Amino acid sequence: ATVSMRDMLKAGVHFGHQTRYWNPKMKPFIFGARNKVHIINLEKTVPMFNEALAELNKIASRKGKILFVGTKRAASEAVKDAALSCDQFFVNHRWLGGMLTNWKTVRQSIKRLKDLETQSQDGTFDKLTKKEALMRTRELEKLENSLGGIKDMGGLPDALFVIDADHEHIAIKEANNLGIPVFAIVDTNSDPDGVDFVIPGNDDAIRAVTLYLGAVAATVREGRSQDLASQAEESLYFQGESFAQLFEESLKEIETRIVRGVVVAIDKDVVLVDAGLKSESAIPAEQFKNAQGELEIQVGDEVDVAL
Amino acid sequence: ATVSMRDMLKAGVHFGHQTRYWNPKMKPFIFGARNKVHIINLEKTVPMFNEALAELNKIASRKGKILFVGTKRAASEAVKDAALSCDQFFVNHRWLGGMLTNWKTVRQSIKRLKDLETQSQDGTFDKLTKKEALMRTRELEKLENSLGGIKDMGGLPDALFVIDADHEHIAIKEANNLGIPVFAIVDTNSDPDGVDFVIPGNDDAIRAVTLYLGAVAATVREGRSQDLASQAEESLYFQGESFAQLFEESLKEIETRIVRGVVVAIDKDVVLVDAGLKSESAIPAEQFKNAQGELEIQVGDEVDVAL
Ligand SMILES: [Zn+2]
Ligand SMILES: [Zn+2]
């Protein structure tokens, strides 16, 4: 996975802040200045982004959970779009101190959110006074704005992808403390020190932000599915055996002896065994019950069967 | 997209029916017979499946809708799994004559399904007698079993993918009449004539059926997203220009003159214009209102702006 330099140039990825606003720590990523404005060196952005994408692909491929964080105007709606498009998670309105470091508390706040969700729907709020119903409605607003993108995360994320390292410094510091790797777009006015995988680039243009998140969402989908990887395993070696050769070889795989197999499905009075024939074999449960009339085997168990 | 011959052999794709059950029309796809059973020639299955996958990829890439059809025991639950995994549609319980050819009627039956959905939830059924409520409950059962996988299809499909051509002959004939292309697994006991893209193979093993649907769902996801295609466009040509060359070239793209731009977002009193700077420009709506105080422009419109 990569984005080309020409694509980044068109999106404005190389536009830094005015030089008077810079953080000197971004010097290695700066190409120069034109008209009192810093130009970001895409010669560095491209390999550093590829490096970031490769590791996010690896994390996603072990069922890793990715938290997209971006709450500034330019990032907010796109962060949600990206996260949804690859079945991950997000914070896009505002960060509450402790979302990560006090995660056991957040977990309870999530159940409280779901209870308030139910209450607002099943008429509980209508049986309250206006003053009370408003209290619960504002609480539900706070919880949904802040936790709505993570309510099904189910534990700490395995990585953070962040738009604007300075704007999101609180979250980045929590991740640091927990040893959660941080991938971030770092603009010329920002401190890169807390960022594990820095991506030098413009964090102020919707089109630039969209370019980054798109490449991220794609590589995360590829990590989960293994679509393109499993496919490009057919070119790694010779596969030109004839069917005839392969079929005759498979006939000699028969030794010796009645057959052996594996349960794949147990619906009452129907036990299903894959013994590698044309069809799986559906067996009456009775052959698999003990003296008390209970099922002895489980889906995935190994068994025997009579040809 | 492809499945290897070794993968098909392991899944049992080559196991045909007993020869006494064959349809002579399947002769070109048959390798031979062992123990009074027909062996399917995978030398033919592999290129014919690749051919089918390539055209399904093309159909999906123009936002085509794919209807997965499989109602026999071995196909039923996997057909649903596959369809869901690539955001398409399915029929997996039983085919009602006219689902395709009388589609304008099906459309009304879909709204009737949604109304019954609401009624069963909002307590309408509880206000009925038992005899009446049972009538509506059975109607809801019929509609959900048959239309549940297509209720958001929104029109005729652009292709059918079918498990077992003989078992699903009714649907295949409706598609024929409507000119909708049929992709189907055709076993040695079946008639291939109605099938546009026949895939000679075992249609009785869950593991074989799973192998086919998996490859289909992947190629459909790839058609929609263009993940792997857009990525493998970076290898088609030289991309070794230095950033310096590219940046200096982009500086000469400035001619002449105040700037020109494109609206991207209109939220009351905030009009957003992309003029290719570091940030999009947010302009007060007032500059864009006519004498009556109405908005003159729309999202996507072209405008002008003062630097
Ligand atoms: Zn910035
Ligand atoms: Zn069959």
Numbering used by the authors:
A (entry chain A), B (entry chain A): 2 to 258, 262 to 311
Sentences from the paper on this structure:
After numerous attempts, we were successful in crystallization of a chimeric protein consisting of protein S2 connected to S1NTD (residues 1 to 86) via a five-amino acid long linker (S2–S1NTD). The crystal packing analysis showed that the interaction between S2 and S1NTD is formed inter-molecularly between two symmetry related molecules. The structure of the S1NTD comprises two spatially separated structural motifs: the 11 N-terminal residues of S1NTD form an α-helix (from here on referred to as S1NTH) that is connected to the four β-stranded globular moiety (from here on referred to as S1D1) via a seven amino acid residues flexible linker. In addition, the core domain S1D1 interacts with S2 via two salt bridges: the side chain of Asp39 of S1D1 interacts with Arg208 of S2, whereas the side chain of Lys43 of S1D1 protrudes towards the Zn2+ binding pocket in protein S2 and interacts via polar bonds with the side chains of Asp188 and Asp205 thereby stabilizing their Zn2+ coordinating position. In the case of S2 and S1NTD however, the PΔG,IF values >0.7 indicate a less specific interaction with a smaller interface area, suggesting that the dominant and specific stabilizing interaction in the complex is between S2 and S1NTH. Thus, we believe that the interactions between S1 and S2 within the chimeric S2–S1NTD complex are physiologically relevant and reflect the interactions between S1 and S2 that are observed on the ribosome.
In sharp contrast, protein S1, which is essential for translation initiation in Gram-negative bacteria (1), is still lacking from the high-resolution structures available for Escherichia coli and Thermus thermophilus ribosomes (2). The protein associates late during assembly of the 30S ribosomal subunit and interacts with a pyrimidine-rich region in the 5′ untranslated region (5′UTR) of mRNAs. Thus, the protein shows RNA chaperone activity and is essential for the binding and the accommodation of structured mRNAs into the decoding channel.
